[PDB]
Ligand binder design. Structure first.
Ligand SMILES: *[C@@H]1O[C@H](CO)[C@@H](O)[C@H](O)[C@H]1NC(C)=O
Lengths: 48, 49
């Protein structure tokens, strides 16, 4: 039976932009999506 | 200013309870900058003009 899975974390800024400060400035205008994505992956990770 | 203050700001609260909170990201920043192309080699004939 499978009990657990890999606990992974993603950095939204490195993935979406990556060594591009101008992109990071544009990303903020989008919103709190990074915060919810980290909250989601952190809950999956503590459950595991 | 402090490690704890980042935890207070992340939780949006003035009290933080016991635990590990992922406050931020650590990135080493580029130090010098090096640009390397192949040897200049051939120079054309402006000299002949
Ligand atoms: C002309 O030749 C001299 C040496 O003979 C050199 O110093 C100079 O830069 C040369 N100029 C051109 C345009 O080739």
């Amino acid at each position: 039976l499978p009990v657990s899975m890999t606990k992974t974390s993603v950095d939204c800024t490195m993935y979406i932009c990556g060594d591009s400060t101008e992109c990071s400035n544009l990303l903020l205008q989008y919103g709190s999506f990074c915060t919810q994505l980290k909250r989601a992956l952190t809950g999956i990770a503590v459950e595991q | 200013l402090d490690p704890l203050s980042e935890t207070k700001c992340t939780l949006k609260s003035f009290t933080v309870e016991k635990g590990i909170y992922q406050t931020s990201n650590f990135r080493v920043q580029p130090t010098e900058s090096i640009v390397r192309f192949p040897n200049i080699t051939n120079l054309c004939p402006f000299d002949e003009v």
